[PDB]
């Protein structure tokens, strides 16, 4: 699919935000690496998510888990899509390339979601052995989480949610590779 290589998405968005935004639809959202988002993904990511962090169905926290991507995905597909139901490579770019001047309530409802996976009692920041729990749980590599969260952090024990809400919008918005929120995601590379 050269579709997010035409002339229109490289004038929106350069490649190495491009691949950034991509990097989100593969790694997260599209759980069964169909090339699509749709509802079957996120009802496959509630199951594995929740399992990964060593829930099952009937715990409060499944339920949680439950509630909110299924909010995710109400927000997500009241985009304007070519089908119903189903999001492409090229409409993800178009969501998110903006997410600086018009932020999506499915957008930040994410951004909660992972923090909150992470800050689990509600402290009010993370820090690197939640950040590296979590995305080991994601199926990423712990060390090079807790690498990420080192270049994240700038050098700070502990990361607040409005850190990380800002940190979350650079990944999606900054040019510049050693960008902080580049780190967000729980990789060091790009
Ligand atoms: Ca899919």
């Known amino acids: 699919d050269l579709g997010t290589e035409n002339l229109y998405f490289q004038s929106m968005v350069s490649d190495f935000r491009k691949k950034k935004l991509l990097h989100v639809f593969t790694a997260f959202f599209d759980t069964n690496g169909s090339g699509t988002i749709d509802k079957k993904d996120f009802e496959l990511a509630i199951e594995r ?94 060390a090079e989480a807790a690498s990420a969260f080192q270049k994240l952090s700038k050098g700070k024990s502990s990361v607040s949610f409005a850190e990380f809400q800002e940190l979350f919008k650079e990944y999606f918005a900054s040019e510049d590779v050693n960008a902080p929120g580049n780190f967000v995601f729980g990789k060091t590379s790009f």
């Open 49 to 142: 998510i929740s399992k990964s962090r060593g829930w099952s169905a009937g715990d409060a926290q499944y339920k949680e888990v439950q509630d909110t991507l299924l909010k995710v995905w109400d927000g997500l597909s009241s985009a304007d899509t070519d089908n119903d139901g189903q999001v492409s490579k090229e409409e993800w770019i178009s969501l998110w390339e903006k997410f600086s001047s018009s932020p999506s309530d499915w957008q930040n409802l994410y951004c909660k979601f992972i923090f909150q996976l992470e800050d689990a009692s509600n402290d009010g920041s993370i820090d690197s052995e939640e950040f590296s729990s979590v995305y080991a749980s994601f199926g990423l590599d712990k």
